[PDB]
């Protein structure tokens, strides 16, 4: 249970390359932040991405 | 009849079978063909009573 609540942004997997072009598996996490947003019953604490929080939002 | 069908199976064909099995164990019961004949009589009585409901 680690993903944006307003979107589906999550982490992915890739490679780490060196000068000699050696490969090593790594992860690409997302910029998650704990925020309290309005929900129909009451506000709660959820994980919201920083991309969704841009241009304004309700908290 | 509902009651007659029950009465015939409970007191008869059940206590009657009790004597046959009891008599055989003691070693004084011939006519072995009378046990299976009564065993299947109860099976038919319980088949009509279950479908008649």
């Amino acid at each position: 249970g680690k993903q944006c609540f307003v979107t589906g942004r999550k982490a992915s997997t890739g490679n780490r390359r060196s000068h000699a072009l050696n490969s090593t598996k790594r992860r690409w996490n997302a910029n998650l932040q704990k925020v309290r947003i309005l929900v129909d019953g009451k506000p709660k604490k959820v994980w919201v991405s920083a991309r969704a929080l841009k241009s304004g939002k309700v908290t | 009849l509902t009651t007659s069908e029950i009465e015939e199976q409970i007191k008869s064909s059940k206590e009657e079978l009790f004597n046959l099995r009891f008599q055989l164990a003691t070693g004084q019961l011939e006519e072995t063909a009378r046990i299976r004949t009564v065993r299947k009589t109860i099976a038919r009585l319980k088949t009509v009573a279950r479908e008649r409901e």
Binding site: - | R21, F22, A25, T26
Partner: protein
Amino acid sequence: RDILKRPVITEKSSEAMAEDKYTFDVDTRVNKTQVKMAVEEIFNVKVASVNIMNYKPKKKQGYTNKRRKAIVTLKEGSDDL
């Protein structure tokens, strides 16, 4: 009820212990309280005591069935089967 299966006939049961004690074979899921009520209803006797014991399967390739024999002691009345 249909809890008794077979009377036991042996030297220990018939020649001895038969003066006032009767041995039977009961179901493998009945306690000694249900054997006292069944004996009286079928044999019209008054039971005073009831002992029970378990037997395990015996290899004979396969094994014989398990048994449970009970001994009842009557206060008044006699079976005389």
